[PDB]
């Protein structure tokens with residue numbers, strides 16, 4: 441009998457499970473495929489506040505999101521850091537005066553302790569923008585490695601004594617005799633599981649209503665508005681460290697975000713989507729849309745041929761019945777119901793990456809009446825697994841290379857920005873490059889891949905190359921198939937057992 445079972449291992453499920461485990465609940469988190477396999481790896485990777493939501497009057501959300509930025513930067517310094525954003529002025533769309541106030545709200549809605557001011561810009565004949573654009577504005581927000589933020593939370597669950605199972609799909613949940621009985625199946629081996637729990641969380645993202653309908657045969661409190669958004673990736677469009685936020689002719693904004701020193705991400709789009717969330721992928725008109733708003737602003741033109749990767753996901757969004765996808769609220773709603781005072785179901789509707797910690801604390805607040813002697817709120821003071829450094833650059837990578845002098849500058853940078861304070865567990869007793877074992881390409885060594893399987897739930901090559909890391913951007917097809925082969929070998933046995 442678990443205290444709490446959480447179904448879903450995106451950001452919301454992992455954040456709720458972690459918060460619960462740290463309040464002394466016995467927790468089990470179930471993830472059908474891999475941690476952050478769906479929406480929580482398909483985001484624009486921003487911890488924001490949501491500048492564009494001010495136009496819609498979403499103060500509560502914007503204020504919350506803005507003040508969380510500083511909390512999240514402290515919790516996960518290895519994977520989250522400040523970024524500057526440049527907004528080119530387009531007075532036919534929004535007048536300078538409106539922007540020159542919008543910016544002060546964004547500055548004093550949360551109360552920031554550390555993120556720099558906000559400034560005007562002028563653009564000259566030599567800038568990266570087309571000459572007709574002569575003015576803009578620059579303000580602070582944060583970038584975060586979305587999929588590794590979910591991983592850090594799953595690690596926290598385990599640290600606090602909780603249990604995490606991936607490749608394990610919950611197939612039903614029903615209330616019997618005052619308890620939940622939850623059934624689940626291993627997606628590979630068909631192994632069936634059944635647990636009892638005192639309380640159940642439905643944090644299944646795009647599937648949240650479907651799990652009501654198919655898993656539980658209970659009425660969903662809300663409908664869900666699956667709104668697809670896609671991103672494109674190109675070799676970095678300029679050498680500047682700032683992101684740009686572009687005002688499009690439809691009133692939407694599109695970002696151009698530096699990524700991994702080598703690339704730029706451009707996105708995103710707002711497309712009503714119907715069908716299987718697993719099948720989501722970018723469409724031609726999204727490519728045309730994103731290249732347009734980029735090419736209208738920047739001198740250096742991009743074509744379809746420059747794109748080197750794309751990705752796509754579906755925002756679950758609580759259905760507030762808005763006619764326009766870009767206007768549907770991005771704020772979350774939690775619903776909780778019990779039967780005869782027992783066996784609460786808490787279901788998550790919406791919930792940006794940015795607000796996950798607050799969402800989780802709110803969830804546990806709602807769950808509290810059901811758990812005698814449950815611990816208090818705690819995560820605001822916590823440091824997630826990997827976060828116990830002190831400046832990423834900065835000097836953690838410098839500090840690493842000082843301890844482990846066989847590390848290249850590039851590899852030390854990768855470990856600091858990926859594993860953070862867990863780098864020493866990865867590197868174990870290594871004292872040369874050869875101690876890292878097989879080189880799979882782009883300084884992705886056996887020591888790393890083994891660590892990922894042992895400590896980061898990696899089961900398949902995509903887990904390691906696209907969620908745990910983004911080494912998939914560099915490894916060729918042959919190298920990616922060798923990673924898959926190594927995993928089959930390592931995970932099939934000699935460590936998976938018969939002891």
Ligand SMILES: Cc1cc2nc3c(=O)[nH]c(=O)nc-3n(C[C@H](O)[C@H](O)[C@H](O)COP(=O)(O)OP(=O)(O)OC[C@H]3O[C@@H](n4cnc5c(N)ncnc54)[C@H](O)[C@@H]3O)c2cc1C
Nearest residue numbers: 448450451452472479480483484486610644645669793794
């Ligand atoms: C295009 C795009 C860009 C975005 N950009 C940002 C941004 O810049 N900043 C920000 O803060 N937010 C952003 N978001 C929003 C954010 O990504 C999502 O709100 C967040 O990822 C929601 O995650 P979730 O945990 O609720 O859903 P998920 O955890 O992603 O989905 C449910 C997960 O649980 C598992 N699961 C589902 N059903 C079952 C079941 N039956 N049994 C067992 N397991 C199951 C799945 O495999 C799935 O991965 C963006 C969203 C989109 C779509």
Ligand SMILES: CCCCCCCCO[C@@H]1O[C@H](CO)[C@@H](O)[C@H](O)[C@H]1O
Nearest residue numbers: 491492493494495538539542543693
């Ligand atoms: C009647 C409502 C008018 C006031 C609108 C609130 C101003 C904030 O509005 C925001 O301003 C930003 C720049 O600061 C823009 O980039 C965003 O797209 C816009 O949503």
Ligand SMILES: CCCCCCCCO[C@@H]1O[C@H](CO)[C@@H](O)[C@H](O)[C@H]1O
Nearest residue numbers: 529530531535536537572573574575
């Ligand atoms: C002159 C327009 C060139 C486009 C580059 C941005 C400079 C716009 O500068 C001006 O901003 C003011 C308030 O919005 C107003 O004087 C005008 O609407 C606008 O032209």
Ligand SMILES: CCCCCCCCO[C@@H]1O[C@H](CO)[C@@H](O)[C@H](O)[C@H]1O
Nearest residue numbers: 535536537538539540541543544560
């Ligand atoms: C610093 C913001 C003060 C708050 C009041 C906003 C008034 C808008 O200040 C802006 O100044 C520009 C000249 O620099 C003009 O081009 C714009 O027309 C004007 O609206």
Ligand SMILES: CCCCCCCCO[C@@H]1O[C@H](CO)[C@@H](O)[C@H](O)[C@H]1O
Nearest residue numbers: 495533534535537538539540541542
């Ligand atoms: C006295 C200080 C002014 C505060 C700004 C109040 C916000 C509403 O301001 C109004 O918004 C309209 C719709 O966007 C605009 O068309 C109007 O020009 C503007 O005056």
